[PDB]
Design a binder for this molecule. Sequence first.
Ligand SMILES: Cc1cc2nc3c(=O)[nH]c(=O)nc-3n(C[C@H](O)[C@H](O)[C@H](O)COP(=O)(O)O)c2cc1C
Length: 362
Amino acid sequence: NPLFSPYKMGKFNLSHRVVLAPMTRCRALNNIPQAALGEYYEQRATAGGFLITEGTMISPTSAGFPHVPGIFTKEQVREWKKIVDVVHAKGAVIFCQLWHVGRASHEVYQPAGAAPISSTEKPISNRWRILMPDGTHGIYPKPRAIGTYEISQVVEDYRRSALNAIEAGFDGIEIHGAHGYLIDQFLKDGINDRTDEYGGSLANRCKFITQVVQAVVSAIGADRVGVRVSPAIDHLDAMDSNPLSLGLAVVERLNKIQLHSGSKLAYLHVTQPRSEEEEARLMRTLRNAYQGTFICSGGYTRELGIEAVAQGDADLVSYGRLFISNPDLVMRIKLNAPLNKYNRKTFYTQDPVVGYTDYPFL
Ligand SMILES: Cc1cc2nc3c(=O)[nH]c(=O)nc-3n(C[C@H](O)[C@H](O)[C@H](O)COP(=O)(O)O)c2cc1C
């Protein structure tokens, strides 16, 4: 089983290649990491295993889900440290995913009920609905297109949150530039209608994610910075006319950043939608073009993950919904043991146990 051959993820010696994909669970009440988060991540941590936390707020204006943890205040850092210490006690490497939703928010989630920010004024169409704090579904409002000065301020929010995660003991951070959120709102030409230096060409649409990466790389180091993108996923009306060209453009900037910094990034993380061969060739092209560690994600199983590593399609494989319902998913993949079903009803609920930590072990 190649999924259990060790891998050198920079200065992090990993014992296996099963990664916990970042998953918003909405158990961090009032954006404060709770003790239930420590138990949730401890159940899934393994010796030498790699975990990526749920999307974490970088600023009071970055949330678009209820009870998502933050890392922009000191109480959040203090509460995050207790969870990191528990995860590190099991011998696992843990990265904190920095998350800004952009236009994928609502007045209820914004300070003073203000409008969400984005690269544009286009709202998410009435097809997609946002989960409300009371369990209902609301309407995505019209966002506020930000100028370049506010862009540099959001970049600073990433840089401060990256340092805060290191203060909390995190081994590194992951930039969430996928799934149609703030960074993806600057990347996809189906959203980015800007006429300034941040819109138009591939280079201008890549300027935001580039500036975000260099800021956190120069703050904490390249080997502790992961990047996640999804050029072929049209979540929240985030479509591009040429996803492969967009992905190759991002890979080109990431390679240039590693050259100027004299060090390689932690990894490149790409999620794919579920033609299978065309989607596989897209993932293979991005992997071949990026000089560094590649993590594949999106509908991966035990059989599909083994072949991804065996054929050289990826260095690490991250699992999502299967890790929700299988706390010992790494052990189940090793033994080829049957997997537990997950309940989509308790994906975003607030109970610290029900649908969170009560999924049974083997
Ligand atoms: C409940 C839930 C929450 C998620 N939250 C996040 C998130 O916060 N950030 C992110 O980048 N991806 C998030 N995702 C996407 C997962 O990473 C996704 O499950 C993974 O990319 C591959 O899906 P699979 O392994 O379940 O097939 C989430 C997915 C689910 C189902």
